Amino acid sequence: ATNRDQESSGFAWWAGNARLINLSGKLLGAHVAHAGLIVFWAGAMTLFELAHFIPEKPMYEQGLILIPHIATLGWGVGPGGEVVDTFPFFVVGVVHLISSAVLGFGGVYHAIRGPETLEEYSSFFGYDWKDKNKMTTILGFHLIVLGIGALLLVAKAMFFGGLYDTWAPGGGDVRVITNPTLDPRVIFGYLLKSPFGGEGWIVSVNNLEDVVGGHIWIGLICIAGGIWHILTTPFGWARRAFIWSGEAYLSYSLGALSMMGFIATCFVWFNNTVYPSEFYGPTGPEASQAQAMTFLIRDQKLGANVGSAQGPTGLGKYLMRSPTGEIIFGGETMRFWDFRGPWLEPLRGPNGLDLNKIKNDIQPWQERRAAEYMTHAPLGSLNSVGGVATEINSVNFVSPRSWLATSHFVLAFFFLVGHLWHAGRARAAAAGFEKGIDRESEPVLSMPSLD
């Protein structure tokens, strides 16, 4: 046993994995075994979801998060997002589950049987954290891998059946993407959009042409960047800016994953394109707008003139103006006027919600959809009692959007903490004071008094 107690390693059991920092073989095992765990869950969770799945209920009434991801890719679904074939879901689950055994095998082998360090075994697989060129090479390999991943999505969309398009003319459907957006003005334009209301940065992406085009760009950027990093070593200015150690690199990635976590939270909360409401349920903004739509329809059927109906405050009860004048739904949902959805858009004119369209053109499928979304708003208790906090037990419902937003906020937050923990530790360790202040060389004692 090498380095497997506190005396020899300097790390207590509860920091046990830090004993692995300079043992590239065992650390490869840890990583491969862990990748096994992720793949295991993806596979097993899918099979669990499928076994529990009732095809004629909406997915979002069934506590499903993985089947919705598969369906968005265009597998197993048809018009309106109706399930036409569960077999693609079965395949995804089984293939992940089988693959996890392989990863688990390699992980266990490297972790307990294989060479503890890889450097003496191989110059290609061995590494020194402080070897800047080797670090950028491995980074380079992984960037190429990621670029290929992004192009796999492009391949599915363009050449292997397409993607589920909630926006498809005549109703949501799986659609092949033949004209992906290549224009860098549009693609990178998203990146420079404000993250505030009515703009929403990248979260605002609202058509599959832009999504696919983005991944073409990202795929090429990642492959080019990967080649770049294999062929180069870090420049002088980068050398002087960073800490070059295993723990430092971990900290950079923790920071990055934290950022991505918060982005994913906002993506699933607001976006209804890559998170189709057919599969994930209505967004918070969507369901609130759907309520206003529902009662506008109801009261207009009863004879209300919804354009001229003045609410208790003086603002229109059903319809009012946004701060820039667009006609929008009234009541509290005034906040949600940036919402856009396939069931609502046919009522939209140049100036916002069109009163003549409202009076004459609302179709029964719009009433149904608005009623459905209003009554599946993403509100519910921790024990999955659907609805407002004062609602009685009866409906077993928490929106997948809530499950996915909350989990990813928690994860992103703790990852920011991990970033700070490890970035601060990497700095201190590099400078040589992570274990405490040298009693005979206490820096503050050589500094002038503040006063």
Partner: protein
Amino acid sequence: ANLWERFCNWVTSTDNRLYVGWFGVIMIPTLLAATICFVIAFIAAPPVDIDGIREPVSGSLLYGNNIITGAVVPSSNAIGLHFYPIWEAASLDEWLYNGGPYQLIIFHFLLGASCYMGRQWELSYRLGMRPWICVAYSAPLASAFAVFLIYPIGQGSFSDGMPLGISGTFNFMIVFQAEHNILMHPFHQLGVAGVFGGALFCAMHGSLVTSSLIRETTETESANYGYKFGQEEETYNIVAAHGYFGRLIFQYASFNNSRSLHFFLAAWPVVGVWFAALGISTMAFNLNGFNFNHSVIDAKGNVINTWADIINRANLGMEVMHERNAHNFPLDLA
């Protein structure tokens, strides 16, 4: 040294009475702007249409508030999550009506307080300290982010951010209870354990160290003079302290290791408050407290109320009364 080199040396100087540093370069102007705007608004701001229903709420001292009722009032529900800087308004009079000061203040504050956290790492590095004081500060900071940014994001409006005022804070709490049943949420319960426990352990540690101070003074002087700043020897007897507390409960429930004890003192409140922050930040996406409304039913099907159902009645009172002119439709969906 050139000018830039000199400037860098001053910024990062360990000799400045207050440390500046690179985080401080952002922190100083942002915190000053937030502070100045807050003070002026709290004294002199006119009423603000918080709920976008042309029903302005007075927050400032000169407009009929005292210290307890006063606030800087959140920006208008008509704005929602839209960015409303001064230059987006047609006039200062419009900016004020719509609650522009709130956005200016909370955005500068959140930026400044994040830099305050970075600055804590930064100085610890310059002084050769271990780096994690900033991780402890991440707990209140995360809590401020929860109530000023994450909750507004989830609900779709800064009008639902916590007001900057004493009574406005209570308003936020009561409405939060109505809409999320926060009391019945385990993350808020962990928060309570965090702060009640933090206070308990604070008093406990205070009392035990104070109890075992080594006699260095006479009765006509404060025992505090028995300790001199920078002395090498510990000022209390930890063995006597542990001897006491280990007998109060039992030996193995007491810390004999000061490093372990002080780590526990850091960890208990910080972790609890992280859960508090995460409670707010996840109820922001309407995953709410436990709902046991009508959970207990008799053999016929009669509802047998529990204390959960009495809570529910209180929550209903809050719900039906809050923002009494703002709802037109039967469900409060955000």
